[PDB]
Amino acid sequence: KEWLPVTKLGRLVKDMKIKSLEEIYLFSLPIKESEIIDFFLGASLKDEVLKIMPVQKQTRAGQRTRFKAFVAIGDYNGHVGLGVKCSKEVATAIRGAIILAKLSIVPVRRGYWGNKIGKPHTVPCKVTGRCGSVLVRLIPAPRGTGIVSAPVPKKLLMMAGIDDCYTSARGCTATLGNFAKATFDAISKTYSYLTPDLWKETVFTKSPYQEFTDHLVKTHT
Amino acid sequence: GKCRGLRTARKLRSHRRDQKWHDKQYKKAHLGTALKANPFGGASHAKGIVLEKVGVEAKQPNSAIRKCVRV
């Protein structure tokens, strides 16, 4: 129940200067501190475990076993994350998966199918991610349909917050880590796709360092 | 698809026919030799009367004898 911010970003977040996490995503700062997201996203950041599988490295005297835990965390109105940690026991492997998933979290965008009435509910276009041999598609769906997929990307898109999707996977789907990372990579690059809805040139607002350099030279060495 | 031409459908149909013929399930289900060698003759059930009761053992990992019958 304490915090010493070792980085400049942590001090800026703690000193009530940076408003949301959206501008941190906008300038693409590397978030090397876990509890920045804890400070921004509160109790709505619900987590659950995907699979705890064992990996074994054999030695001369028997074989040594380690457990790696795939854990996805995310908020149901946008941001979703995913983290893999391999350690000795299971509980601190779960905690390492929590901290590494809270480190690696990205925002998503939501669009419309056909008609633009109300809140966005589905993915804006056909987006596709790939890791390993696993190829995952995310195709927009009409309103009130629901996610149709395997249960693991289904729960990943529900914790992402999208209500409607169409999916089509290919490859060794049974490897849950590769499938989860492929779905996370597919949903992460929605801000890497250029659309005519935002063809206008973005005004270059300054970095928070450019306005809070006085505060940081007061509070740091 | 490999041969993509606007006036090419007989070649695609014949090649698909040959590669469909060169299969396992389709070759079994569309040749008469399998049903000639089928004891049931392509039927779900069959009747019969008992010759004798014999006994055969299991494979290498499982150690038991399974008591089949000769009909």
Binding site: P124, C125, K126, T195, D197, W199 | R4, G5, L6
Partner: protein
Amino acid sequence: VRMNVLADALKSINNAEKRGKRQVLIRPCSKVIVRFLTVMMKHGYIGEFEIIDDHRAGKIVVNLTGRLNKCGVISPRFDVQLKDLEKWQNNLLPSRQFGFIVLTTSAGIMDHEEARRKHTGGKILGFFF
């Protein structure tokens, strides 16, 4: 040898757009290539494109901008109807809010929404988004 000049031109401009350059040397010339690039210009995807006059074959130099995702060719030329085009934009366009399908029409080389509102159809050419 060469079969479609539009396929080579679209592949060349797609490769030069992915590498991030700004000028593309389209070596063939055709009426369908000029009309296709004119449609892409009218829908706000490219800028000033050239036609270099020569007594052999013209060359086209385009002014690229960071606006094109992928432009491609559907070979061979598939004829469509008005009801048949919906499946083509279902399985070819990435979304319904953007993207275009250019198809040959007796009214000229012209996209799919305009061919829909003019109650017509014809052979397909390609797509861009």
